[PDB]
A paper describes a structure:
We co-crystallized a human [name] peptide (residues 1 to 20) containing the α1 helix with the OBN domain of human [name] (residues 1 to 120). In the 1.6 Å structure, residues 6 to 17 of [name] form a 2-turn amphipathic helix followed by a β turn, while the rest are disordered. The peptide binds to a shallow OBN groove that corresponds to the DNA-binding grooves of other OB domains. The amphipathic helix of [name] overlaps with one of the p53 peptides, while the β turn coincides with part of the other p53 peptide. The mixed basic and hydrophobic character of the OBN groove complements the acidic-hydrophobic nature of the [name] peptide. Four arginine guanidinium groups and one backbone amide group of OBN contact two side chain carboxylate and three backbone carbonyl groups from α1. One of these OBN arginine residues (Arg43) splits the otherwise hydrophobic groove, demarcating two hydrophobic pockets. One pocket (Ile33, Met57, Leu87, Val93 and Ile95) binds to the hydrophobic face of the [name] helix (Leu7, Leu10 and Met11), while the other pocket (Leu45 and aliphatic portions of Arg31, Arg43, and Ser54) binds to Phe15 and Trp16 from the β turn of [name]. Using ITC, we found that the [name] α1 helix (residues 1 to 20) binds to the OBN domain of [name] (residues 1 to 120; thereafter Rpa70N), while the [name] OB domain (residues 21 to 122) binds to the [name] fragment containing DBD-A and DBD-B (residues 181 to 422; thereafter Rpa70AB), with Kd values of 34 ± 7 and 46 ± 10 μM, respectively.
Author numbering:
A (entry chain F), G (entry chain G), H (entry chain H): 6 to 17
B (entry chain C): 5 to 34, 39 to 120
C (entry chain A), D (entry chain B): 3 to 34, 38 to 120
E (entry chain D): 4 to 34, 39 to 119
F (entry chain E): 5 to 16
């Protein structure tokens, strides 16, 4: 859950 | 603002503080999940996730860019790569974005 | 084959600004009025910290789009030459091509620019 | 209704920078090294030519994004006050909201700022 | 070798006997595509240039691209409804490739 | 139209 | 350098 | 401005 929500940069 | 709180959470992970932070920006990851860029006045950090139960604070604009809030309950999880993420579970908005009007100080990214 | 190997030496020696090199950010440090961000950059061959970010690009730093290990293309820069002969690059336009999250590590084994 | 009426007077009088006004470009004139552009802007109520474009934004002028009659939002500016008391606005960051072609005309009936 | 002052002259009086040497600054397709060009004479730049459809191969095979220098051998000037004048490029020769020029020449400003 | 469409919008 | 620039009128 | 910024080491 958290791993996927944080794999991207905050701003695209 | 609770200057030094971001460093402390990242370095010690002491849940037992209730820091005062400024929201700098809020970005959804798309039922939305909201990730926040927060400032303690000294540092900014985007490793904040809003618990789903708090979504109405964002959607009704209580929690928005430049508002000042106090965090009452949060937890720190560490990812596999060693990065820490803060999950915000309970908070209160002390001053609205409109009342504050601007970014407070000149915070720089947490870099340690 | 991701980085413009040799671009750092080329800028320091020639001073020409008609290239759009692809570089990796190694570290970013503020000089503190808005902060001014100084960057330690790599071209895969060399590293050098003679890079200043135009303040218009501070949001890329502050929103963490530009951070350590990201790969970026420099679309516009200016060179200034100090009294002491050091060239300083002011980064005027850049595009993050791959996030720090996606790259994950320093690319290769660059050494400090030393000529 | 599209322009930040009264923002020019606010800036000239109060000198505060915590606003992001929407203005119309009336004309742009180079003072000629990169050229430096000076702008005559309108907030729908007043016009004023005491605007200088940051060098970083020059490509917007050169690519015609920023041109006569376009509507833009100012995201960051700096106020400087001359010895003689005149205030000058340095436009640091802006976004063109509507092209000159899209707008097509000068909006409303602004008069020169005169206080 | 740019024909400094040629764009201003063509926009004022439209003398099709000027065979100007110009630099291409950028090329944008309008969707077969029609190519619009931002051109420079070293003094001014202007985007009021359309390439005749028959010259599309020059763009598509990269002979005509940003920074190349070309000579216009044949053009016509049209006037739109709003009074804006547009040059249709009918015959040109690329004198120096984008790669050989390498850079925008001079500090041209928009034709005003 | 014809040429009016090509010039209808800004260059960029 | 703003002082120098502002010594002239917009058009002149 | 730049001379003053570059007077210090990257890591200070």
């Amino acid at each position: 859950e958290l791993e996927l929500l944080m794999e991207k940069s905050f701003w695209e | 603002l609770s200057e030094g709180a971001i460093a402390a959470i990242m370095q010690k992970g002491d849940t037992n503080i209730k820091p005062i932070l400024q929201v700098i920006n809020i970005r959804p990851i798309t039922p939305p999940r909201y990730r926040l860029l927060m400032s303690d006045g000294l540092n900014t950090l985007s490793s904040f996730m809003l618990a789903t139960q708090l979504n109405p604070l964002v959607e009704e604009e209580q929690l928005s860019s430049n508002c000042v809030c106090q965090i009452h309950r949060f937890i720190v999880n560490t990812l596999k790569d060693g990065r820490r993420v803060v999950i915000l579970m309970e908070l209160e908005v002390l001053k609205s974005a409109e009342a504050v009007g601007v970014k407070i100080g000149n915070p720089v990214p947490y870099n340690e």
